Structure formats: structure tokens, C-alpha cells
């Protein structure tokens, strides 16, 4: 499995973010520590 | 892309009714997690803190999740750790929260697809104040006396206000009693207050001088006219002091004086913000908690209008006081600066294109391009062979029209037609029957300066043409190829009866479309590479086989002093588990005339996709994964990276003539070491099992003869060919097979736009349920995997 | 200014204007003194047709130095040609694929230097081409003109033949004049 | 044993496979390098085997024996208990460690 090209069916993945951007820089008013949470309402393992 | 098994109570994959708490600390920096309120024994640390950090969730079809960011944008189900702030405080008062895809080159709405350019930046929210530097501004002595008056008048502007707010003079200040010891005459004022007022007035004077404004004392008789205000006895406190602020109601300010007042207010705001930042304060959302949280440390534009006026009133009072005394201010015009603009790199412009197999070699074809955002965009036809790293139409591979400047591009630029505006529709027609190309803007033909409708004519067909468009920064467009000609807007007005058919006419399924993405990738150096050349040197009895890299066009008028990123074609994979010889070796010889300070030599993993004009080992992608015990004691710490190299500068510092650097890798232990001229350097790296490392040299050329890979051998160390090719594993003869070739990084590539996309749905559930993201319909694709490149 | 309004709401005045312009242009093409007189007028009076054509941009980077009277006139910018070029979309308007077949036939007949009556007779014989509107290969044109009124009298062979004859004459002569202009 | 079990999704922790029982398990086996070589979920057919009959390789059977009902776990079968010097020709190379994402669907 190192000479012939491989093929395989892969699930498509997507990323999602809120509108929150945090940075660290000298002489900036940004606060360093931050926190958030995610609630998982439903996961269907092995859908495909 | 390497998982590290972390220890937790009730370990299990994320499932329904799971609450994941994520904590970030840019101070260390460190990223840590919690599952259902229970800590996870591990964290990330020592990563690059450049750029902006945002929360993110990656998912495939079949999930529903809810972001909780505190406040009204989500109710936290667990107490944040002490000192950690909810994410909703990172928004500006103007900004409204939303959920968006991380990267996006297209947006579909109700079956209409908009092709997007690139966004220049994001919501930085980093003020980084830079007030005018008045340290070198020297206050003229003759302006001090008037200044000494103004601050005194400023003192009145304080004291009277204390009377107007109900404050009463007392020995000791009391908030409940509205008391303050400072409620006294300027002469009787404490030394600290007078020093503060004098320092503020001197700062203002230096700010005015630094702006270039010229102060002229032209009204000596105005000071006599100026009078105070006879405040009644109710103002005076028990001490016997009654404020006498100067009567400045009659004073009027010019528009230039108003501009000066506004600029002074902005400068004062920036100075105060810098002072607060130095004090440890930080911007907050509608909270002024004394833990160095102030909601006003923002840019002046975003500042509250009331907050602006709070100090603008005092600044205008000072300006009117100055005008009354006769010190007129004359600022200089700002047009003397003569500003300029920058040029957007070709890597940041996004090309969209129809697939080469749809190229047309005959007939008359028509397609439209709607410009949602009027701006820097180009549209036209492209030959198979058009490259994504060259501006559309700057060569002979594309015939385009640019409507922002009203030009036409083919092997150059020529003014043609007229510029467009938002909501315009460009109809592009090609007549391959008689080699003609026509454009229309809103159903009206665009004609050249000579009155001809033919934007282009008399071209060689060769392979054919496909529709192409190029979108700049923040630009949007809609390419309509005619899959439904009734969706055309000006096809019937100009295009239908003239014999032009929609490009995608009599087609059953949508047209495959490609785009250009900026993902740097190593590709083999061609025989026609314009900058570098590679020569193979066979291995003799003493000299091992070599690959000599030299600069084609250095020292001439076409010299390009830019970095070169070279890699070897085949990798050297470490063993899957760690504990005849298991060590591999290769060397690099840098010829005389190549400065060793501009040469980095080592290994790169397959996931190295960095390209920049200036390279530096300090600015490298890295991270450390710490794994702790049940009590948090660290029992492991893994450091990742994608570039294990050494700098020639450090070697020469610890050490004209050619310089030889040898790189050795213990595969059984995954240990990388380096040695310059036999002596072993102290720079050693450790890598995990199953790690593929390609030999790599990154250098800025200073001579025509650059360097050479030497695929030699030494005792207890295999040659590179032996470690790469299993056929020569037993054979100890060094070899350089034709599959082993030198590759260089190229920064842009074509990439196929997927036929279908995940249907993600976002929605604000409520003020306590946060934001919902769901994806339910499954999607898949058949991927082809190139094994060596991983 | 009014071409879009005429196209979206067809009427009889627009068609009559197209017929008049086409007839004048045809007389201009056939006649040889007409073209010479127009050119003489344009050159002698120094009329710049580009003002009346493209008057409705590289100036800062151009220093013109060559000018000749012979370069003041060209068939491309002639108003007689340009008016027909701008009124042609009002004459081809609402042409179904059958009418396009008839127009192609008429242009082919004109290519052999036949009179109007001969072409009208040929269109009268080959009046079965209208069924090309029912072809499957050109089913994509069936609803292009749905928004337009598409309101007309009962089908008449003579009117269709005359309309196709005028359209084909104008198109053929325009193509003939424009071909030499190409390099 | 030669199998290392790493839990993914817990089961009941009480019902374990016994002798003369069919273990209907859905699995996904790949090589130690990340190259998948088998998966019963692609075929839509759970794999059935009986404990104590030596139908399957030793590591797989031991891992399913340790697993409980409705449990999804990762089993690492070393070459000692999964082929070894002689593997499946054309599928599994010699002396290859195997990794199975095994779910114990049913005990019937």
C-alpha cells in the first residue's frame, strides 16, 4: 500500500465558529482568559 | 492530526446530553477542557499566540449542538473557573453575535450561489493605542504663562462642577457627604492637583505643537476684555472660596477650531486608554468591575457619544479660553502627507473557472456574470493552461474584461468599454466561428475607442476556452452559465437572436467548476523552472551520488532575491513502535559564495504548508500536549511540529570554504541529530512513531551555485536510498533513483469545487439555550490517497 | 434610451421604425453615390461620429499627435449603419426557431443575388420549416419570451414571409458590409 | 493477554459473552499505519462468531470476551495473536499489528 494510489469513501466534515475573536498583543485591551461551552443535543454515531 | 489518549472519569466519546467546557489562557498560553463538569487530565500549551483565536466545532452529518457563550447568548451550565471570562464579553457593542463557517468561498441562498472573494481580516478588537508622541515637543516659554492661566481656568471648570453636582468642601472627602478637600482656591490647591493640572496642560500644548499647528498671540487687548462669571454665594463653600470661571459664552469657534477640538479629544482618549492599559485595565462589556475591567478601552470611533462629550466639553472650554486670550491656532493642511495604497498579492485573489473538459472549440456561446459588489473583478474566457498565480489576462492564456477600471486584458491592458457598478450584469459572448469576443454591460454592447463591438478578435483556437472569473478582496459575483436560459437577464436583449447559445445548453447536470486555493505544496522542479536548476551527479568510488541545486538567474537584471523552499521527493518513515542498523543519514554541502546564515537544513513533515518571503525558525508552528494524573501531576509531555531544521548561522557562530551539514535520524528511536563538519551539534529533536520526514533545505540565494544534497553513507548509518526504498534495504550501495528528485514549494493550486455541500443550519434558540447548529443529511466522497505524500 | 422599453412591450411603431431604417440602410448599401456623398459630407464638415455614438478613460495617459481627414470617416461609425445595428434587435424580437430557420433560408437565397420576390416565393415553398419550433433540440427557447406580451393576430403566412424577408435582407446586407471591416 | 482494550462507548458492564453464545459484533479493522483493511459496517452485515470454537483470530475473540453488551471499544491485536509471520496475502502484510473498532451489538 505504498505504490498504488488508494481509494476510500470518507465523510465530509464542516467547521462552525461564533463571531468571537480573541488575540494577545502588547499594549492591547484584550483580556487573556476566556471560557465557553458546547451542549451536545444528539449524536448519531455510524450514520454512514 | 495526531490523537493523544487523555484520561478522564467516565471516559467515552462525545454523545447526547454532554456539556463540554473549553478554557483558553493566552497568558501561558494554555488550552484546557472539562467534560460534564469533570476535568480532563491533559491540556495544550506553548503554541503560537499570533493571530486571533476563536471557538470552533468540527462535525459531520448527524449531529445537533448548541454554543453557550454566557449572558443572553447562552446560559452556562457550569461555573467558569475563577478569572475566566465568558466569550460573549469579547464582542463590541455594535457587533451582533452569529454563527458562520470558518472558511468560505461561496454562499448559496434559495438556489442562487454567490462566489466570494477573500476577506482581508477579521474582528481584531485590539485597540493598541498609539497617541501622538509629545515627548520631543518643547513648550515655548512665551506660551507657558497663558498655559498657566488655562489650567487655572481648568481648575475653575472643576470646582464649580463640584458645586453643581452637590459636592461640599470639607477637610476629608466623603462620597456620602459629597465632600472633597480639593474644593479650594488654585493658590491653596494641594501641590499634587496643581502638578496634575500643569502636566495635563503641558501635554495638551505639546500635542498641539506636534500637530504642526502654529500658535500666534495676536490679541494682546483681548485679555483685558475677557471677564469671569459672578457666581452667587450658593456656589462658595464654607472655606470662603467661590469659583469664578471665565465668561466664555460669547466665544465662538471656527470649523477648523472644531476639527482641532475633535482631534484633541481623540488624542486625549487614546492617551487615557494607553494609561489604563498600562495600569492593567482591559476592555469589558458593560461592566466596570474593579478587577481591571473597563468597558471604555476601545477605539475612539466605537466610543460612546456621551463619553466623547464628557471630555470634549472640557477640551472645547480650553480651546475657547485660548481663543479668548488671543492665542490663535493655525493648523497646516494634511494634503502634504501624500499618502499611498498597497497592492494585493496574487495569492489573495480567488479564481473561479469551468473545468477544462468543457472547453469549446467552435460555435457561438454566451454566459453572464452578475457583479453583486462593484469592485476589483475580472470576467472572460480562459485557455486550458491558465495558471492561478498570474493575474487574469497578464499573459496569453486568458481574455478578460475588468469593469472597475474599464479595461480589457490579454497580454497586457487596454482601456475598453465603461466601468460597472453594483447589480450590473456582464454578458460575455464568444464567436469561435470567426474568432471574436464581445462583452455587454446591462444588455448594451461595450465598444472600443474606435467604435468596434469586438473586445477581442483574431485569436488562435488551440485547445479551446472555458468561462473564468477572478474576484478580489471582499468581492462577490454570480456566474450564470445558462443551465436555465430563462434565468438570464439580458440574453434576449442582446445574445439570443444574434446566434449565441447559453454555455450550458442541452446539459443534464450542473457544470463542474474549479477554483484557486492558496495551499502551498511541494512540486517537482521542472526543466523550465525560471529560477533554479537541479543536476544529478552519479556516485563514483569516493564521491556519493549527489543532487546539485544552482540558481539560474542570479547576478543578472532579472535576479530574484527571494526564499527558496526545497524538499526531497520521497520521505523516510519512522517505525510504528519504539524500543541491522536503524539509522539513516544524508548531508548537504553549501558551496563557497552561499552565506551559511541564510540556509536552514533539516527535515519537514508532510503537513508543512508555509510560504513566506522571510523565514525564521523562532516563528514556527508548535504545540505541547501535557498529560496529567488524577491529581494533575504531569506524567508525559509531547511536543509536535512540522519543521525540524537547524540554522547555518548558529553553526557558523559555533564554528570562504564549502560547509557540510549532516543530518542523521534514528528510526527505531525517532531521534534527529545534526553535525556540521563532523562535530555533533547540540540541536536534537524527538518525533513520534509513524512520522514521515522529508529532507529539506530553505535558503535565500546569494550566489549562482547554491548547494547540493549528498546521499552518502557512514558507518552504522544507512544511505537515504536504503531507508526509502525497500528494494535496496539489504544493499549498502548508495543510489539516487530517478524517483528521488528535488521539489520546490509553489503557493497556489487549482482545486475542484465539490458537487454537493453539507447543509448546515444555524439558529438562535433563545437567550438561555444559546445558538443551535445541526447537520442531519449524510454526505460522502470517494477520496484518492497518494501514499508517500500522506 | 427606449430600446429596452420597446423590447419589453412590443408595438407597431417600433416595427415600422425598424422597417424604415432597414430600407434606408439597404438603399445606402446598394447605391454607390450614396456612400460617397455621405463620406464627403462627413469629411468636409468634420463631423465626429464617435461623439454621436459613444458620447453617452486613458485620457490622462494619451498625447494624440496624428490626425487626418480620411480617418474622420469609417463604415463602422457611420450613422446609417449604426442606426440599423441598434434597431435590429427590435426587428428580430420574438423570433421562434422556425422563424430563425426561415431567416437563414432567406439569407442563403440572398447570397445568390436574388430579388425580393424570388426570396418570398422560396419562403412560400419552404413553409414547413416552422415545425422546427417543435424540435426537442431547441426546446430551451420555448419559454424565453414568456414575460413579453406575445400577443398577436391569427397566424398568417404572407405576413410571416414578409417579416422574414425584411429581417433577412437587413441582416445579410449588414453582414456583407461588416465583413470587409474585419482584418 | 496480547490484546489491549481501550473503551470508546461503555456498555452495561454486567452482561459478558459466555460459552456457546453468538457475539453479533460490528467491527472495523485497520493496519497499525492507518490503512483500513476490513469493515462489516460497509457490508451492512454484523459479524457473528461463537466463543470457545476458535472461529476468529485469538486477539479478536479475547477482546470480544472482555467486552460487555452494547460496548464499543478499540482492540489492538499484536501479530502474536493475529496471524504473524504469515498474514492474509494481498491484504495483511507479515508481522502486522491490527486495530479493530469493535462494537458488541448482540449476545444472541
Swiss-Prot record, chain D:
Signal peptide: none annotated. Gene3D superfamilies: 3.10.50.40. Its main location: cytoplasm. Keywords: Cytoplasm, Isomerase, Rotamase, Sarcoplasmic reticulum. GO terms for biological process: 'de novo' protein folding; calcium-mediated signaling; insulin secretion involved in cellular response to glucose stimulus; negative regulation of calcium-mediated signaling; negative regulation of heart rate; negative regulation of insulin secretion involved in cellular response to glucose stimulus; negative regulation of release of sequestered calcium ion into cytosol; neuronal action potential propagation. It catalyses: [protein]-peptidylproline (omega=180) = [protein]-peptidylproline (omega=0). It is found in: Cytoplasm; Sarcoplasmic reticulum. GO terms for molecular function: calcium channel inhibitor activity; calcium channel regulator activity; FK506 binding; peptidyl-prolyl cis-trans isomerase activity; signaling receptor binding; transmembrane transporter binding. Inhibited by both FK506 and rapamycin. Residues 20-108 form the PPIase FKBP-type domain. Detected in heart muscle (at protein level). Isoform 1 and isoform 2 are ubiquitous with highest levels in brain and thymus. GO terms for cellular component: calcium channel complex; cytoplasm; membrane; sarcoplasmic reticulum membrane; Z disc. Its EC number is 5.2.1.8. Coiled coil: none annotated. It is an enzyme of class 5 (isomerase). Has the potential to contribute to the immunosuppressive and toxic effects of FK506 and rapamycin. PPIases accelerate the folding of proteins. It catalyzes the cis-trans isomerization of proline imidic peptide bonds in oligopeptides. Identified in a complex composed of RYR2, FKBP1B, PKA catalytic subunit, PRKAR2A, AKAP6, and the protein phosphatases PP2A and PP1. Interacts directly with RYR2. Belongs to the FKBP-type PPIase family. FKBP1 subfamily. This is Peptidyl-prolyl cis-trans isomerase FKBP1B. It comes from Homo sapiens. The gene is FKBP1B.
Amino acid at each position: 500500500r505504498n505504490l498504488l494510489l488508494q481509494t476510500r469513501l470518507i465523510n465530509d466534515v464542516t467547521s462552525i465558529r461564533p463571531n468571537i475573536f480573541l488575540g494577545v498583543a502588547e499594549g492591547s485591551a484584550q483580556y487573556k482568559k476566556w471560557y465557553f461551552e458546547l451542549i451536545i443535543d444528539q449524536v448519531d454515531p455510524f450514520l454512514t | 492530526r495526531i490523537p493523544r489518549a487523555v484520561a478522564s472519569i467516565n471516559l467515552h466519546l462525545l454523545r447526547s446530553d454532554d456539556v463540554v467546557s473549553c478554557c483558553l489562557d493566552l497568558g501561558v498560553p494554555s488550552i484546557s477542557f472539562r467534560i460534564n463538569g469533570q476535568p480532563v487530565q491533559g491540556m495544550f500549551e506553548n503554541f503560537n499566540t499570533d493571530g486571533l483565536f476563536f471557538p470552533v466545532v468540527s462535525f459531520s452529518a448527524g449531529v445537533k449542538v448548541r454554543f453557550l457563550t454566557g449572558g443572553r447568548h447562552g446560559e452556562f451550565k457550569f461555573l467558569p473557573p475563577s478569572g475566566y471570562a465568558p466569550c460573549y464579553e469579547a464582542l463590541l457593542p455594535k457587533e451582533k453575535m452569529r454563527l458562520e463557517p470558518v472558511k468560505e468561498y461561496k454562499r448559496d441562498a434559495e438556489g442562487i450561489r454567490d462566489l466570494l472573494g477573500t476577506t482581508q481580516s477579521l474582528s481584531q478588537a485590539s485597540f493598541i493605542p498609539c497617541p501622538i508622541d509629545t515627548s520631543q515637543v518643547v513648550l515655548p516659554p512665551h506660551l507657558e504663562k497663558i498655559r498657566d492661566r488655562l489650567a487655572e481656568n481648568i481648575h475653575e471648570l472643576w470646582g464649580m462642577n463640584k458645586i453643581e453636582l452637590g459636592w461640599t468642601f470639607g477637610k476629608i472627602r466623603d462620597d456620602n457627604k459629597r465632600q472633597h478637600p480639593c474644593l479650594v482656591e488654585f493658590s491653596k490647591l494641594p501641590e499634587t492637583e496643581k502638578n496634575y493640572n500643569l502636566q495635563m496642560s503641558t501635554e495638551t500644548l505639546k500635542t498641539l505643537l506636534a500637530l504642526g499647528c502654529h500658535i500666534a498671540h495676536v490679541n494682546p487687548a483681548a485679555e483685558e476684555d475677557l471677564k469671569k462669571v459672578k457666581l452667587p454665594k450658593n456656589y462658595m463653600m464654607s472655606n470662603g472660596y467661590k469659583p469664578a470661571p471665565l465668561d466664555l459664552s460669547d466665544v465662538k469657534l471656527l470649523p477648523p477650531q472644531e476639527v482641532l477640538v475633535d482631534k484633541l479629544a481623540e488624542n486625549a482618549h487614546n492617551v487615557w486608554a494607553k494609561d489604563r492599559i498600562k495600569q492593567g485595565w482591559t476592555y469589558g462589556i458593560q461592566q466596570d468591575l474593579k478587577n481591571k475591567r473597563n468597558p471604555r478601552l476601545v477605539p475612539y470611533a466605537l466610543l460612546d457619544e456621551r463619553t466623547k462629550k464628557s471630555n470634549r466639553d472640557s477640551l472645547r472650554e480650553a480651546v475657547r479660553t485660548f481663543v479668548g486670550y488671543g492665542y490663535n491656532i493655525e493648523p497646516s493642511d494634511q494634503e502634504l502627507a501624500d499618502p499611498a495604497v498597497e497592492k494585493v498579492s496574487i495569492d489573495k485573489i480567488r479564481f473561479f473557472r469551468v473545468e477544462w473538459s468543457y472547453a469549446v472549440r467552435s460555435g457561438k456561446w454566451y454566459f453572464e456574470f452578475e457583479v453583486v459588489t462593484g469592485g476589483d473583478m475580472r470576467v472572460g474566457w480562459a485557455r486550458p493552461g491558465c495558471r492561478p498565480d498570474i493575474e487574469l489576462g497578464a499573459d496569453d492564456q486568458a481574455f478578460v474584461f475588468e469593469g472597475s477600471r474599464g479595461q480589457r486584458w490579454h497580454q497586457g491592458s487596454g482601456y475598453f468599454g465603461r466601468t460597472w457598478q453594483p447589480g450590473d450584469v456582464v454578458g460575455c459572448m464568444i464567436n469561435l466561428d470567426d474568432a471574436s469576443m464581445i462583452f455587454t454591460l446591462n444588455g448594451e454592447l461595450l465598444i472600443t475607442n474606435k467604435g468596434s463591438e469586438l473586445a477581442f478578435a483574431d485569436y488562435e483556437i488551440e485547445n479551446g476556452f472555458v468561462p473564468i472569473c477572478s474576484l478580489g478582496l471582499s468581492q462577490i459575483g454570480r456566474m450564470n452559465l445558462g443551465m436555465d436560459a430563462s434565468t438570464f437577464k439580458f440574453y434576449t436583449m442582446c445574445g439570443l437572436q444574434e446566434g449565441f447559445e447559453p454555455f450550458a445548453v442541452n446539459m443534464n447536470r450542473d457544470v463542474a467548476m474549479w477554483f484557486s486555493k492558496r495551499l502551498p505544496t511541494f512540486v517537482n522542479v521542472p526543466k523550465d523552472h525560471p529560477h533554479i536548476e537541479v543536476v544529478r551527479i552519479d556516485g563514483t568510488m569516493d564521491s556519493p551520488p549527489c543532487l546539485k541545486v544552482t540558481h539560474k538567474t542570479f547576478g543578472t537584471q532579472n535576479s530574484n532575491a527571494s526564499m527558496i523552499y526545497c524538499r526531497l521527493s520521497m520521505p523516510v518513515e519512522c517505525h510504528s513502535s519504539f524500543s541491522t542498523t536503524t539509522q539513516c543519514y544524508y548531508a548537504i554541502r553549501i558551496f563557497a559564495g552561499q552565506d551559511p546564515s541564510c540556509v536552514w537544513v533539516g527535515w519537514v513533515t508532510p503537513d508543512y504548508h508555509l510560504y513566506s518571503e522571510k523565514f525564521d525558525l523562532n516563528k514556527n508552528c508548535t504545540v505541547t500536549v501535557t498529560l496529567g494524573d488524577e491529581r494533575g501531576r504531569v506524567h508525559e509531555s509531547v511536543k509536535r511540529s512540522n519543521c525540524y531544521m537547524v540554522w547555518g548561522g548558529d553553526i557558523v557562530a559555533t564554528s570562504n570554504v564549502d560547509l557540510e551539514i549532516g543530518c542523521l535520524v534514528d528510526l527505531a528511536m525517532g531521534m534527529l541529530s545534526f553535525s556540521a563538519n563532523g562535530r555533533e551539534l547540540g540541536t536534537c529533536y524527538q518525533v513520534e512513531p509513524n512520522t514521515k520526514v522529508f529532507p529539506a533545505v530553505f535558503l535565500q540565494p546569494t550566489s549562482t551555485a547554491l548547494f547540493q544534497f549528498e546521499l552518502g553513507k557512514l558507518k552504522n548509518a544507512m544511505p537515504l536510498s536504503a531507508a526509502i526504498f525497500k528494494s535496496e534495504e539489504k544493499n549498502p550501495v548508495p543510489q539516487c533513483p530517478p524517483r528521488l528528485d528535488v521539489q520546490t514549494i509553489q503557493p497556489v493550486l487549482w482545486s475542484r469545487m465539490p458537487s454537493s455541500f453539507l447543509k448546515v443550519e444555524t439558529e438562535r434558540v433563545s437567550e438561555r439555550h444559546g445558538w443551535a447548529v445541526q447537520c442531519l443529511e449524510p454526505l460522502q466522497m470517494m477520496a484518492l490517497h497518494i501514499p508517500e505524500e500522506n | 434610451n427606449n430600446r429596452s422599453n420597446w423590447l419589453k412591450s412590443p408595438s407597431a411603431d417600433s416595427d415600422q421604425l425598424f422597417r424604415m431604417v432597414a430600407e434606408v440602410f439597404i438603399l445606402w448599401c446598394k447605391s454607390h453615390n450614396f456612400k460617397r456623398e455621405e463620406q464627403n459630407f462627413v469629411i468636409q464638415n468634420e463631423i465626429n461620429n464617435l461623439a454621436f455614438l459613444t458620447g453617452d478613460g486613458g485620457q490622462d495617459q494619451e498625447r494624440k499627435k496624428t490626425k487626418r481627414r480620411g480617418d474622420l470617416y469609417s463604415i463602422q461609425t457611420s450613422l446609417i449603419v449604426a442606426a440599423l445595428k441598434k434597431m435590429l434587435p427590435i426587428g428580430l424580437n420574438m423570433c421562434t426557431p422556425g422563424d430563425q430557420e426561415l431567416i437563414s433560408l432567406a439569407k442563403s437565397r440572398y447570397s445568390y443575388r436574388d430579388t425580393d420576390e424570388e426570396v418570398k416565393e422560396h419562403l412560400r415553398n419552404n413553409l414547413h420549416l416552422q415545425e422546427k419550433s417543435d424540435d426537442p433540440a431547441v426546446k430551451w427557447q420555448l419559454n424565453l419570451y414568456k414575460d413579453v406580451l406575445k400577443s398577436e393576430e391569427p397566424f398568417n403566412a404572407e405576413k410571416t414571409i414578409e417579416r422574414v424577408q425584411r429581417i433577412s435582407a437587413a441582416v445579410f446586407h449588414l453582414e456583407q458590409v461588416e465583413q470587409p471591416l474585419r482584418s | 493477554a496480547g490484546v489491549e482494550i481501550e473503551t470508546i462507548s461503555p456498555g452495561d458492564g454486567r452482561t459478558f459473552p459466555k460459552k456457546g453464545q453468538t457475539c453479533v459484533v460490528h467491527y472495523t479493522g485497520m493496519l497499525q499505519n492507518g490503512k483500513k483493511f476490513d469493515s462489516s459496517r460497509d457490508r451492512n452485515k454484523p459479524f457473528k462468531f461463537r466463543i470457545g470454537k476458535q472461529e476468529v483470530i485469538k486477539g479478536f475473540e479475547e477482546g470480544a470476551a472482555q467486552m460487555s453488551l452494547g460496548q464499543r471499544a478499540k482492540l489492538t491485536c499484536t501479530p502474536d495473536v493475529a496471524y504473524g509471520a504469515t498474514g492474509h496475502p494481498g491484504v495483511i502484510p507479515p508481522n502486522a499489528t491490527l486495530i479493530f473498532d469493535v462494537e458488541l451489538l448482540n449476545l444472541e
